[PDB]
Structures are given as structure tokens and as C-alpha cells.
mmCIF file of C-alpha atoms and ligand atoms in Angstrom:
data_model
loop_
_atom_site.group_PDB
_atom_site.id
_atom_site.type_symbol
_atom_site.label_atom_id
_atom_site.label_comp_id
_atom_site.label_asym_id
_atom_site.label_seq_id
_atom_site.Cartn_x
_atom_site.Cartn_y
_atom_site.Cartn_z
ATOM 1 C CA UNK A 82 -2.196 10.035 -15.428
ATOM 2 C CA UNK A 83 -5.514 11.872 -15.068
ATOM 3 C CA UNK A 84 -8.267 9.523 -13.911
ATOM 4 C CA UNK A 85 -11.803 10.367 -12.839
ATOM 5 C CA UNK A 86 -13.444 7.992 -10.383
ATOM 6 C CA UNK A 87 -17.175 8.084 -9.823
ATOM 7 C CA UNK A 88 -18.910 6.543 -6.810
ATOM 8 C CA UNK A 89 -22.209 5.118 -8.061
ATOM 9 C CA UNK A 90 -25.563 6.514 -6.998
ATOM 10 C CA UNK A 91 -27.200 5.349 -3.768
ATOM 11 C CA UNK A 92 -28.977 2.033 -3.247
ATOM 12 C CA UNK A 93 -31.273 1.073 -0.375
ATOM 13 C CA UNK A 94 -28.347 -0.321 1.591
ATOM 14 C CA UNK A 95 -26.730 3.110 1.842
ATOM 15 C CA UNK A 96 -29.515 4.529 3.987
ATOM 16 C CA UNK A 97 -29.888 1.143 5.695
ATOM 17 C CA UNK A 98 -26.205 0.884 6.493
ATOM 18 C CA UNK A 99 -25.685 -2.658 5.235
ATOM 19 C CA UNK A 100 -22.356 -3.880 3.783
ATOM 20 C CA UNK A 101 -22.759 -3.709 0.007
ATOM 21 C CA UNK A 102 -20.144 -5.589 -1.998
ATOM 22 C CA UNK A 103 -20.988 -8.015 -4.775
ATOM 23 C CA UNK A 104 -24.691 -8.120 -3.879
ATOM 24 C CA UNK A 105 -26.202 -6.729 -7.111
ATOM 25 C CA UNK A 106 -28.649 -4.087 -5.898
ATOM 26 C CA UNK A 107 -30.342 -1.510 -8.122
ATOM 27 C CA UNK A 108 -30.165 2.262 -7.672
ATOM 28 C CA UNK A 109 -32.949 4.007 -5.763
ATOM 29 C CA UNK A 110 -34.948 6.816 -7.366
ATOM 30 C CA UNK A 111 -32.612 9.313 -5.693
ATOM 31 C CA UNK A 112 -29.628 7.236 -6.842
ATOM 32 C CA UNK A 113 -30.789 7.722 -10.422
ATOM 33 C CA UNK A 114 -31.271 11.446 -9.789
ATOM 34 C CA UNK A 115 -27.667 11.620 -8.613
ATOM 35 C CA UNK A 116 -26.467 9.719 -11.683
ATOM 36 C CA UNK A 117 -28.355 12.048 -14.019
ATOM 37 C CA UNK A 118 -26.838 15.139 -12.393
ATOM 38 C CA UNK A 119 -23.394 13.822 -13.352
ATOM 39 C CA UNK A 120 -24.269 14.205 -17.033
ATOM 40 C CA UNK A 121 -22.489 17.311 -18.260
ATOM 41 C CA UNK A 122 -20.230 17.411 -15.211
ATOM 42 C CA UNK A 123 -17.765 14.687 -16.221
ATOM 43 C CA UNK A 124 -15.126 14.962 -18.982
ATOM 44 C CA UNK A 125 -15.494 13.204 -22.352
ATOM 45 C CA UNK A 126 -12.949 10.418 -21.987
ATOM 46 C CA UNK A 127 -12.918 6.664 -22.560
ATOM 47 C CA UNK A 128 -15.191 5.192 -19.904
ATOM 48 C CA UNK A 129 -14.899 1.996 -17.895
ATOM 49 C CA UNK A 130 -17.304 0.667 -15.303
ATOM 50 C CA UNK A 131 -17.739 -2.005 -12.686
ATOM 51 C CA UNK A 132 -20.121 -4.589 -14.163
ATOM 52 C CA UNK A 133 -22.473 -4.428 -11.183
ATOM 53 C CA UNK A 134 -25.900 -2.977 -11.994
ATOM 54 C CA UNK A 135 -25.664 0.098 -9.765
ATOM 55 C CA UNK A 136 -22.379 1.129 -11.383
ATOM 56 C CA UNK A 137 -23.419 0.355 -14.984
ATOM 57 C CA UNK A 138 -26.703 2.238 -14.534
ATOM 58 C CA UNK A 139 -24.868 5.231 -13.078
ATOM 59 C CA UNK A 140 -22.568 5.319 -16.108
ATOM 60 C CA UNK A 141 -25.570 5.026 -18.421
ATOM 61 C CA UNK A 142 -27.562 7.804 -16.747
ATOM 62 C CA UNK A 143 -24.395 9.902 -16.782
ATOM 63 C CA UNK A 144 -24.480 9.905 -20.571
ATOM 64 C CA UNK A 145 -21.756 7.236 -20.895
ATOM 65 C CA UNK A 146 -21.531 3.837 -22.601
ATOM 66 C CA UNK A 147 -18.568 2.265 -20.707
ATOM 67 C CA UNK A 148 -16.703 -0.997 -21.203
ATOM 68 C CA UNK A 149 -17.456 -3.320 -18.316
ATOM 69 C CA UNK A 150 -14.689 -4.675 -16.054
ATOM 70 C CA UNK A 151 -15.209 -6.818 -12.883
ATOM 71 C CA UNK A 152 -11.852 -5.448 -11.680
ATOM 72 C CA UNK A 153 -13.675 -2.222 -10.772
ATOM 73 C CA UNK A 154 -16.098 -3.947 -8.395
ATOM 74 C CA UNK A 155 -16.474 -3.042 -4.744
ATOM 75 C CA UNK A 156 -14.662 -5.405 -2.361
ATOM 76 C CA UNK A 157 -16.293 -8.818 -1.919
ATOM 77 C CA UNK A 158 -17.544 -8.889 1.696
ATOM 78 C CA UNK A 159 -18.227 -12.623 1.652
ATOM 79 C CA UNK A 160 -20.313 -13.695 4.642
ATOM 80 C CA UNK A 161 -20.453 -10.041 5.682
ATOM 81 C CA UNK A 162 -22.455 -9.126 2.555
ATOM 82 C CA UNK A 163 -25.679 -7.487 3.748
ATOM 83 C CA UNK A 164 -24.662 -7.293 7.394
ATOM 84 C CA UNK A 165 -25.442 -4.099 9.267
ATOM 85 C CA UNK A 166 -22.298 -2.031 9.845
ATOM 86 C CA UNK A 167 -23.632 -1.433 13.347
ATOM 87 C CA UNK A 168 -23.556 -5.144 14.261
ATOM 88 C CA UNK A 169 -20.166 -5.922 12.752
ATOM 89 C CA UNK A 170 -17.715 -7.577 15.147
ATOM 90 C CA UNK A 171 -15.225 -4.945 16.425
ATOM 91 C CA UNK A 172 -12.379 -6.806 14.695
ATOM 92 C CA UNK A 173 -14.040 -6.210 11.323
ATOM 93 C CA UNK A 174 -15.098 -2.664 12.192
ATOM 94 C CA UNK A 175 -11.569 -1.715 13.207
ATOM 95 C CA UNK A 176 -10.125 -3.470 10.162
ATOM 96 C CA UNK A 177 -12.399 -1.468 7.859
ATOM 97 C CA UNK A 178 -11.945 1.813 9.738
ATOM 98 C CA UNK A 179 -8.164 1.449 9.652
ATOM 99 C CA UNK A 180 -8.391 -0.105 6.152
ATOM 100 C CA UNK A 181 -6.026 -2.977 7.001
ATOM 101 C CA UNK A 182 -5.991 -6.682 7.822
ATOM 102 C CA UNK A 183 -9.510 -7.390 6.637
ATOM 103 C CA UNK A 184 -10.299 -10.924 5.546
ATOM 104 C CA UNK A 185 -14.011 -11.809 5.593
ATOM 105 C CA UNK A 186 -14.843 -15.526 5.385
ATOM 106 C CA UNK A 187 -16.001 -16.424 1.888
ATOM 107 C CA UNK A 188 -14.845 -13.020 0.734
ATOM 108 C CA UNK A 189 -11.935 -11.015 -0.608
ATOM 109 C CA UNK A 190 -9.134 -9.664 1.605
ATOM 110 C CA UNK A 191 -8.388 -5.936 1.578
ATOM 111 C CA UNK A 192 -4.916 -6.781 0.276
ATOM 112 C CA UNK A 193 -6.332 -8.749 -2.660
ATOM 113 C CA UNK A 194 -8.851 -5.960 -3.270
ATOM 114 C CA UNK A 195 -6.134 -3.313 -3.429
ATOM 115 C CA UNK A 196 -3.957 -5.488 -5.685
ATOM 116 C CA UNK A 197 -6.913 -6.015 -8.030
ATOM 117 C CA UNK A 198 -7.811 -2.330 -8.121
ATOM 118 C CA UNK A 199 -4.287 -0.987 -8.490
ATOM 119 C CA UNK A 200 -3.379 -3.567 -11.146
ATOM 120 C CA UNK A 201 -6.375 -2.372 -13.154
ATOM 121 C CA UNK A 202 -5.342 1.273 -12.797
ATOM 122 C CA UNK A 203 -1.777 0.463 -13.914
ATOM 123 C CA UNK A 204 -3.165 -1.060 -17.086
ATOM 124 C CA UNK A 205 -4.900 2.146 -18.160
ATOM 125 C CA UNK A 206 -3.065 3.644 -21.142
ATOM 126 C CA UNK A 207 -4.653 7.100 -21.072
ATOM 127 C CA UNK A 208 -7.029 9.369 -19.104
ATOM 128 C CA UNK A 209 -10.448 7.819 -18.502
ATOM 129 C CA UNK A 210 -13.594 8.029 -16.372
ATOM 130 C CA UNK A 211 -14.152 5.061 -14.062
ATOM 131 C CA UNK A 212 -17.631 4.287 -12.759
ATOM 132 C CA UNK A 213 -17.036 2.343 -9.593
ATOM 133 C CA UNK A 214 -17.683 1.945 -5.855
ATOM 134 C CA UNK A 215 -17.064 3.671 -2.542
ATOM 135 C CA UNK A 216 -14.412 1.177 -1.483
ATOM 136 C CA UNK A 217 -12.483 1.575 -4.732
ATOM 137 C CA UNK A 218 -12.541 5.369 -4.493
ATOM 138 C CA UNK A 219 -11.492 4.968 -0.846
ATOM 139 C CA UNK A 220 -8.569 2.699 -1.685
ATOM 140 C CA UNK A 221 -7.324 5.211 -4.240
ATOM 141 C CA UNK A 222 -7.775 8.296 -2.057
ATOM 142 C CA UNK A 223 -6.160 6.618 0.952
ATOM 143 C CA UNK A 224 -3.197 5.490 -1.131
ATOM 144 C CA UNK A 225 -2.784 9.122 -2.129
ATOM 145 C CA UNK A 226 -2.677 10.018 1.586
ATOM 146 C CA UNK A 227 -6.177 11.551 1.945
ATOM 147 C CA UNK A 228 -9.465 10.655 3.642
ATOM 148 C CA UNK A 229 -11.269 8.383 1.201
ATOM 149 C CA UNK A 230 -14.945 8.892 1.966
ATOM 150 C CA UNK A 231 -17.036 10.543 -0.762
ATOM 151 C CA UNK A 232 -20.839 10.794 -1.219
ATOM 152 C CA UNK A 233 -22.859 8.531 -3.508
ATOM 153 C CA UNK A 234 -23.074 9.914 -7.024
ATOM 154 C CA UNK A 235 -19.968 12.024 -6.493
ATOM 155 C CA UNK A 236 -16.620 11.948 -8.292
ATOM 156 C CA UNK A 237 -12.932 12.639 -7.801
ATOM 157 C CA UNK A 238 -10.149 13.262 -10.294
ATOM 158 C CA UNK A 239 -6.607 12.146 -9.529
ATOM 159 C CA UNK A 240 -3.206 12.234 -11.187
ATOM 160 C CA UNK A 241 -2.469 8.570 -10.567
ATOM 161 C CA UNK A 242 -0.344 7.532 -8.672
ATOM 162 C CA UNK A 243 0.785 10.962 -7.438
ATOM 163 C CA UNK A 244 -2.033 13.171 -6.134
ATOM 164 C CA UNK A 245 -5.709 14.026 -5.876
ATOM 165 C CA UNK A 246 -6.823 16.789 -8.244
ATOM 166 C CA UNK A 247 -10.420 17.543 -7.344
ATOM 167 C CA UNK A 248 -13.474 16.233 -5.482
ATOM 168 C CA UNK A 249 -16.846 16.932 -7.118
ATOM 169 C CA UNK A 250 -20.174 16.666 -5.321
ATOM 170 C CA UNK A 251 -23.505 17.944 -6.614
ATOM 171 C CA UNK A 252 -26.742 18.774 -4.794
ATOM 172 C CA UNK B 1048 5.216 7.574 -6.458
ATOM 173 C CA UNK B 1049 5.440 8.046 -2.688
ATOM 174 C CA UNK B 1050 7.179 5.232 -0.824
ATOM 175 C CA UNK B 1051 8.087 5.218 2.847
ATOM 176 C CA UNK B 1052 11.181 3.154 3.608
ATOM 177 C CA UNK B 1053 11.156 2.205 7.274
ATOM 178 C CA UNK B 1054 14.155 0.741 9.052
ATOM 179 C CA UNK B 1055 13.037 -1.741 11.704
ATOM 180 C CA UNK B 1056 13.638 -1.074 15.378
ATOM 181 C CA UNK B 1057 16.889 -2.067 17.032
ATOM 182 C CA UNK B 1058 17.855 -5.635 17.878
ATOM 183 C CA UNK B 1059 20.745 -6.735 20.119
ATOM 184 C CA UNK B 1060 23.151 -6.956 17.190
ATOM 185 C CA UNK B 1061 22.763 -3.220 16.548
ATOM 186 C CA UNK B 1062 24.192 -2.233 19.929
ATOM 187 C CA UNK B 1063 26.731 -5.035 19.581
ATOM 188 C CA UNK B 1064 27.785 -4.107 16.066
ATOM 189 C CA UNK B 1065 27.252 -7.507 14.443
ATOM 190 C CA UNK B 1066 26.270 -8.084 10.805
ATOM 191 C CA UNK B 1067 22.521 -8.637 10.815
ATOM 192 C CA UNK B 1068 20.992 -10.160 7.687
ATOM 193 C CA UNK B 1069 18.814 -13.260 7.552
ATOM 194 C CA UNK B 1070 19.447 -14.146 11.214
ATOM 195 C CA UNK B 1071 15.921 -13.764 12.591
ATOM 196 C CA UNK B 1072 16.550 -11.720 15.724
ATOM 197 C CA UNK B 1073 13.699 -10.183 17.746
ATOM 198 C CA UNK B 1074 13.434 -6.495 18.661
ATOM 199 C CA UNK B 1075 14.807 -5.235 21.988
ATOM 200 C CA UNK B 1076 12.449 -3.398 24.351
ATOM 201 C CA UNK B 1077 13.851 -0.148 22.960
ATOM 202 C CA UNK B 1078 13.309 -1.466 19.458
ATOM 203 C CA UNK B 1079 9.677 -2.003 20.326
ATOM 204 C CA UNK B 1080 9.473 1.515 21.784
ATOM 205 C CA UNK B 1081 10.874 2.894 18.523
ATOM 206 C CA UNK B 1082 8.279 0.947 16.559
ATOM 207 C CA UNK B 1083 5.436 2.335 18.649
ATOM 208 C CA UNK B 1084 6.653 5.897 18.124
ATOM 209 C CA UNK B 1085 6.280 5.408 14.364
ATOM 210 C CA UNK B 1086 2.517 4.941 14.751
ATOM 211 C CA UNK B 1087 2.122 8.687 15.218
ATOM 212 C CA UNK B 1088 4.046 9.570 12.077
ATOM 213 C CA UNK B 1089 3.665 7.074 9.222
ATOM 214 C CA UNK B 1090 0.861 7.685 6.715
ATOM 215 C CA UNK B 1091 -1.861 5.050 6.361
ATOM 216 C CA UNK B 1092 -0.840 3.749 2.924
ATOM 217 C CA UNK B 1093 -0.838 0.114 1.763
ATOM 218 C CA UNK B 1094 1.832 -1.681 3.789
ATOM 219 C CA UNK B 1095 4.440 -4.266 2.888
ATOM 220 C CA UNK B 1096 7.144 -5.814 5.024
ATOM 221 C CA UNK B 1097 10.173 -8.030 4.992
ATOM 222 C CA UNK B 1098 9.031 -11.389 6.399
ATOM 223 C CA UNK B 1099 11.736 -11.357 9.103
ATOM 224 C CA UNK B 1100 10.466 -11.004 12.678
ATOM 225 C CA UNK B 1101 12.017 -7.633 13.491
ATOM 226 C CA UNK B 1102 10.400 -6.044 10.435
ATOM 227 C CA UNK B 1103 7.012 -7.704 10.971
ATOM 228 C CA UNK B 1104 6.947 -6.693 14.632
ATOM 229 C CA UNK B 1105 7.920 -3.114 13.766
ATOM 230 C CA UNK B 1106 5.015 -2.913 11.286
ATOM 231 C CA UNK B 1107 2.610 -4.378 13.851
ATOM 232 C CA UNK B 1108 3.587 -2.005 16.661
ATOM 233 C CA UNK B 1109 3.444 0.899 14.208
ATOM 234 C CA UNK B 1110 -0.217 0.047 13.568
ATOM 235 C CA UNK B 1111 0.034 -1.790 10.206
ATOM 236 C CA UNK B 1112 -0.950 -5.221 8.833
ATOM 237 C CA UNK B 1113 1.604 -5.648 5.990
ATOM 238 C CA UNK B 1114 1.700 -7.953 3.011
ATOM 239 C CA UNK B 1115 4.870 -10.019 3.456
ATOM 240 C CA UNK B 1116 7.608 -10.131 0.808
ATOM 241 C CA UNK B 1117 11.004 -11.806 1.259
ATOM 242 C CA UNK B 1118 12.290 -9.432 -1.433
ATOM 243 C CA UNK B 1119 12.363 -6.763 1.287
ATOM 244 C CA UNK B 1120 14.830 -8.702 3.417
ATOM 245 C CA UNK B 1121 18.270 -7.377 4.327
ATOM 246 C CA UNK B 1122 21.113 -8.938 2.336
ATOM 247 C CA UNK B 1123 22.006 -12.497 3.378
ATOM 248 C CA UNK B 1124 25.458 -12.237 5.007
ATOM 249 C CA UNK B 1125 26.105 -15.980 4.847
ATOM 250 C CA UNK B 1126 28.984 -17.003 7.092
ATOM 251 C CA UNK B 1127 29.338 -13.324 8.042
ATOM 252 C CA UNK B 1128 25.966 -13.277 9.824
ATOM 253 C CA UNK B 1129 26.703 -12.206 13.393
ATOM 254 C CA UNK B 1130 30.297 -11.276 12.703
ATOM 255 C CA UNK B 1131 31.534 -8.105 14.402
ATOM 256 C CA UNK B 1132 31.789 -5.260 11.905
ATOM 257 C CA UNK B 1133 34.956 -4.268 13.755
ATOM 258 C CA UNK B 1134 36.651 -7.594 12.938
ATOM 259 C CA UNK B 1135 35.522 -7.931 9.306
ATOM 260 C CA UNK B 1136 38.448 -8.420 6.961
ATOM 261 C CA UNK B 1137 39.476 -4.994 5.579
ATOM 262 C CA UNK B 1138 38.299 -6.153 2.151
ATOM 263 C CA UNK B 1139 34.758 -6.676 3.415
ATOM 264 C CA UNK B 1140 34.662 -3.290 5.175
ATOM 265 C CA UNK B 1141 35.955 -1.525 2.061
ATOM 266 C CA UNK B 1142 33.327 -3.184 -0.146
ATOM 267 C CA UNK B 1143 30.451 -2.469 2.227
ATOM 268 C CA UNK B 1144 31.617 1.139 2.628
ATOM 269 C CA UNK B 1145 31.865 1.685 -1.112
ATOM 270 C CA UNK B 1146 28.747 -0.491 -1.569
ATOM 271 C CA UNK B 1147 30.263 -2.746 -4.275
ATOM 272 C CA UNK B 1148 32.064 -6.085 -4.651
ATOM 273 C CA UNK B 1149 30.531 -8.014 -1.784
ATOM 274 C CA UNK B 1150 29.603 -11.707 -1.926
ATOM 275 C CA UNK B 1151 30.129 -13.570 1.381
ATOM 276 C CA UNK B 1152 30.447 -17.382 1.389
ATOM 277 C CA UNK B 1153 27.047 -19.000 1.804
ATOM 278 C CA UNK B 1154 25.388 -15.614 1.392
ATOM 279 C CA UNK B 1155 24.046 -13.276 -1.278
ATOM 280 C CA UNK B 1156 25.976 -11.079 -3.691
ATOM 281 C CA UNK B 1157 25.480 -7.343 -3.123
ATOM 282 C CA UNK B 1158 24.367 -7.275 -6.757
ATOM 283 C CA UNK B 1159 21.775 -10.048 -6.449
ATOM 284 C CA UNK B 1160 20.565 -8.202 -3.360
ATOM 285 C CA UNK B 1161 19.957 -4.957 -5.233
ATOM 286 C CA UNK B 1162 18.399 -6.915 -8.091
ATOM 287 C CA UNK B 1163 15.931 -8.387 -5.618
ATOM 288 C CA UNK B 1164 15.114 -5.033 -4.002
ATOM 289 C CA UNK B 1165 14.595 -3.062 -7.215
ATOM 290 C CA UNK B 1166 12.497 -5.727 -8.925
ATOM 291 C CA UNK B 1167 10.168 -5.481 -5.931
ATOM 292 C CA UNK B 1168 10.164 -1.676 -6.041
ATOM 293 C CA UNK B 1169 9.462 -1.482 -9.759
ATOM 294 C CA UNK B 1170 6.567 -3.875 -9.224
ATOM 295 C CA UNK B 1171 4.705 -1.635 -6.775
ATOM 296 C CA UNK B 1172 1.462 -0.320 -8.261
ATOM 297 C CA UNK B 1173 0.579 2.318 -5.689
ATOM 298 C CA UNK B 1174 2.106 4.419 -2.863
ATOM 299 C CA UNK B 1175 3.166 2.319 0.108
ATOM 300 C CA UNK B 1176 4.881 2.021 3.475
ATOM 301 C CA UNK B 1177 7.689 -0.539 3.381
ATOM 302 C CA UNK B 1178 8.945 -2.074 6.639
ATOM 303 C CA UNK B 1179 12.438 -3.212 5.817
ATOM 304 C CA UNK B 1180 16.140 -3.125 6.737
ATOM 305 C CA UNK B 1181 19.107 -0.775 6.822
ATOM 306 C CA UNK B 1182 20.666 -2.200 3.681
ATOM 307 C CA UNK B 1183 17.448 -1.902 1.680
ATOM 308 C CA UNK B 1184 16.916 1.693 2.787
ATOM 309 C CA UNK B 1185 20.557 2.448 1.971
ATOM 310 C CA UNK B 1186 20.192 0.899 -1.496
ATOM 311 C CA UNK B 1187 17.185 3.121 -2.276
ATOM 312 C CA UNK B 1188 18.791 6.290 -0.941
ATOM 313 C CA UNK B 1189 21.970 5.615 -2.927
ATOM 314 C CA UNK B 1190 19.884 5.037 -6.066
ATOM 315 C CA UNK B 1191 18.561 8.577 -5.613
ATOM 316 C CA UNK B 1192 22.058 9.952 -5.126
ATOM 317 C CA UNK B 1193 21.948 10.397 -1.357
ATOM 318 C CA UNK B 1194 23.783 9.056 1.692
ATOM 319 C CA UNK B 1195 21.796 5.994 2.752
ATOM 320 C CA UNK B 1196 22.518 5.755 6.477
ATOM 321 C CA UNK B 1197 19.398 5.970 8.672
ATOM 322 C CA UNK B 1198 18.912 4.996 12.362
ATOM 323 C CA UNK B 1199 16.933 1.894 13.432
ATOM 324 C CA UNK B 1200 13.264 2.768 13.877
ATOM 325 C CA UNK B 1201 13.513 5.782 11.570
ATOM 326 C CA UNK B 1202 12.081 6.303 8.076
ATOM 327 C CA UNK B 1203 12.645 8.060 4.783
ATOM 328 C CA UNK B 1204 9.948 9.001 2.310
ATOM 329 C CA UNK B 1205 10.824 9.137 -1.383
ATOM 330 C CA UNK B 1206 9.084 10.084 -4.604
ATOM 331 C CA UNK B 1207 10.247 6.996 -6.480
ATOM 332 C CA UNK B 1208 12.276 7.004 -8.599
ATOM 333 C CA UNK B 1209 12.897 10.767 -8.634
ATOM 334 C CA UNK B 1210 13.984 12.107 -5.230
ATOM 335 C CA UNK B 1211 13.878 11.979 -1.453
ATOM 336 C CA UNK B 1212 10.814 13.688 0.053
ATOM 337 C CA UNK B 1213 11.720 13.838 3.744
ATOM 338 C CA UNK B 1214 13.656 12.002 6.428
ATOM 339 C CA UNK B 1215 11.968 11.087 9.718
ATOM 340 C CA UNK B 1216 14.625 10.482 12.365
ATOM 341 C CA UNK B 1217 13.129 10.165 15.838
HETATM 342 NA NA1 NA C 557 28.482 -16.133 11.003
#
């Protein structure tokens, strides 16, 4: 099933390199610029969005009025929320780099994150645009056997759960 | 949907030819070598594994941190666990060769086994790498109309539930 996944526009923690999960940060001015550029570049399909501000605002600026779902949220980093990637203990760094065996104290395990995300995707009855987060887009791309890193304010379309269709980035 | 069915590395009962089901045997040094070789071939998809030691250890040495599911276990051979394939009553051999009519005392029925395996498979919500056992791999291959015999430490990728994608025999 055709699904478009949008990584929300940038927040301060992108340039700062801090782990951004459930911390509800707003978009930066450039983040809004990115979100606005998506208007007219995404298909007219039912829209769903993470309920976190940065996602919702991206969907709004993108000319959409999505139905909010917490299931589309970035992974919950727990105690690692706000920590600099640079200072993360190697065990966590490796876990995140290899996308496996990640269980932050007070947070959500990668396994639970994937289950949550994939269960939501399974429930979709028809093509739709999903305003979400880098980790969600990554989980989906990796499951489809490809590198999962995409720029803020960019999107990817996939034929779930079979293959990636296109990656769209704007300048 | 892409699923990789991985047969765990060899244990001592493989070279001995004994029925290996729920008996929790460890891998041999060669079994561990086979597991390590898989690290350079298996895709980095979500991983799942039988909770038995040989499967878990294979996943670990192959570079994965799998979610554990008993549904991925080999069939429970009951009193036949550890029995030499060579000495199995002709009726048992026949059934296991035809893959039907097998229910050992104190064990699982070949039917309840398949029921367990396919319920798990139909429940998957995304592509995955499954560290499991010979019987499970065989069940999946047979379901797709193919011969299901694969060597320990090898793998088979399938586009479930349509066809086999490729076999990886090292
Ligand atoms: Na026995």
C-alpha cells in the first residue's frame, strides 16, 4: 500500500545534536520554511500526524489538516531525552547505529517502538500521508532493507511492506 | 513481505543424527563459526528468534538482538528427543519424510507445530530476520511448494506468502 512518510522540519536540537524524542520542541524558522516547501509537493491523500508540535505544525504548513495519532511519535528516549549524541555511552551509540537492542531507562525500547509503528501502519486501510519523525522514517526504510536517514522536512513514499518508491528532498 | 528464515548453527546432535527439538543444546565451535559467517550476509531487518539457546546464540553471533518467541521453536519431539534418526520406528521416518501424521508421546503434533509457526508468521507486521530451526524452515519452504531441507547455519529468504527469493548456503 502506497504510504508517504514526512520527516518534520528542523528544531534547535537538530543543529545542536541532542536526542529528540517526546520532548515537545517547536520548529525553527528554517524548519517552518522546510514545511512550507512541502506544500504542493505531497499527494492529496488522507493525512495522519504525530501529535507532537513539530510534526503537527509541519503538516499544517504543508497545507494539511491531519488526524493526530501518538502512535506516529518519535521513539521515547527516556533519560536520554536531550542528551548530546556526542556524549552518549558507546553501548547506546552502537545500539542506535545498529538499530538494535536499545532500551533507555525511563524510555521505550527499540523493539516496542517498532511494534508500535508497524502496528499503526498495518491498520491503515488506504494510501495516506504520514507526518512523523526521523526515527519512524528510519524504522520503515531499514525494514525495507535501505539506509534510513533522510533530511528534516523531506519525505519518502513506500509500497508498504514491500519496497521504497521515492525519496523527496527540497532545497 | 520479505522474511529471512535462518537455521541455527550446528549442535552435537546434528553430527550425531539425533532428533533435536526442545532439548536445549548449545552450539558447537563450528556452529558458532557458522553463526559468525552470517553476520556478513543477513540484512539488518527487525529480528526475532526461537528462545532456545542455539537459536539465540546464532542471532547474537550474527550481530542481532532478537525479540524472543517460543512460537519459533522446533517441534517438541517428546520421548523422541535425542533418539537416533537411524533407529526411529519406520512409521516415524515415513511420517517425517512425508511431513504428515507425526505426534510423538509427550511431544507436539506435527499439525499443532505448523499451527504455531504459521500463526506467528501471519502476525508479523514488517520484514524480518527469523532465527529458528530446521523444521520451521522446512515448514515454510514446503508451504511455498519447495523442498525444505537447508544446512545448519544457512538461510533462505522468502517473499511471504508468495515465493522463495534466494537461498544462502555457506
Ligand atoms: Na528421548
